[PDB]
Design a protein around this ligand. Sequence first.
Ligand code: NA
Ligand code: NA
Length: 247
Amino acid sequence: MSETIIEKYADTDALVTAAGDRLASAITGALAERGKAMIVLTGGGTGIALLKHLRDVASGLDWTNVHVFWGDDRYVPKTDPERNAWQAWEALLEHVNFPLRNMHAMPNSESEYGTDLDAAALAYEQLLAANAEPGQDCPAFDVHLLGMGGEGHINSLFPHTDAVKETQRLVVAVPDSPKPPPQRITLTLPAIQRSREVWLVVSGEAKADAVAAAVGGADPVDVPAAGAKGIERTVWLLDEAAASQLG
Ligand code: NA
Ligand code: NA
């Protein structure tokens, strides 16, 4: 029943600027109203580009009031180039005074869960509950950022998978992603749906069919992005290419 907003920008650069400015404003707003912002970060070129923009325009925010979580990450070493958290570190977090006690990265392959990816996912579920309000099992994320693949995948939720079918668990292990690397930890649709707002930031014609399918009410098991819905609103931030199958 929540509101849906679709914004279209000329190209990837205009999209990233607009999305990064929207994020700066959303963080400022949450700090002004509650003295706290809870943001779920994503990986991917566009998602990281948005963080580089935030560094450019909002380095002066009070980061001690900003708390960051991840929607997914790759089960590889901490400083591996394929880590979403390390990419956000290099794009933004290492360049500001951001206390590490506020940073909540997912486990990596050196975290001593070893081959037990499911235990690693349980651990992140425990972290979500510890950082939630009393009696809640997940923070009320102010914004969950998302990228989307050409098949509509979001976080590491792929079509026709157990992860996208999960209705109870908030975090699960993915042993078999068809996009490299195969092993990830991911927030599920129920976790995404704890967010006040979910923003999908999407660029390129290769994604236009999936965007249209998702806006057009596909089953999330067929097109995972269709399940990515905020409590207050869902926001599609597109370039014209990614929007080219919408009206
Ligand atoms: Na604080
Ligand atoms: Na931490």
